[PDB]
Amino acid sequence: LLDLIWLETILPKTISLAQMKMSTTITSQKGLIKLYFLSFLITILISTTLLNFHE
């Protein structure tokens, strides 16, 4: 109840499962091309008009 199962859920498990889920969400992009260039487009627009860098 304190050491083994609960401490191994609080420190390793949350971190490890968080990194595993962020991996399975980010690197699981299916290999299109239009998706990548639309990502380029939303990157350019969100750099210009939302959080401006020239101003």
């Binding site: 992009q29 939303i42 969100i46 401006n52």
Partner: protein, 140 residues
């Protein structure tokens, strides 16, 4: 974005209540627009109506985070009335994390959201109180 986060920090802490929640809903709606734009431009949700549904859901959850965060910020600042602690905004970020866990309907995941969002809100208030330069000096 920049001008409305400067609007948020222009609102003192301090009690100028629920304009804080208006600014925090605006911040959350901006962040939801960001992540919703990624999630609709990297998925092809098939179709356009489902994409609008996912964007509205993401912006609604993030605006709910900002709204309830600013509400319990004002509630701490008016009830306990300690203006310059990280403890009240630790409580506030935990409130935002638990309401995110409510809107995603997960309980231990909502507790993890409480822990991490409370620690980040404590970091933001704490470093802004002491004064820690964001992103750079950029001098040497």
């Amino acid at each position: 974005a920049k001008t409305l986060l400067h609007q948020y920090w222009d609102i003192p802490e301090g009690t100028e209540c629920h304009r804080k929640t208006y600014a925090a809903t605006s911040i959350g709606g901006a962040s939801g627009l960001v992540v919703s734009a990624y999630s609709v431009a990297l998925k092809t949700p098939t179709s356009f109506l489902e994409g609008v549904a996912r964007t509205g859901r993401y912006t609604f959850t993030a605006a709910a985070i900002g709204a309830i965060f600013g509400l319990t910020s004002c509630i701490s600042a008016q009830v306990r009335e300690k203006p310059d602690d990280p403890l009240n905004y630790l409580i506030g970020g935990c409130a935002g994390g638990l309401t995110l866990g409510a809107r995603t309907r997960s309980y231990g995941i909502g507790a993890a959201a409480c822990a991490y969002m409370g620690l980040t809100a404590a970091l933001v208030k704490m470093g802004q109180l002491e004064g820690w330069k964001v992103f750079a000096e950029p001098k040497v």
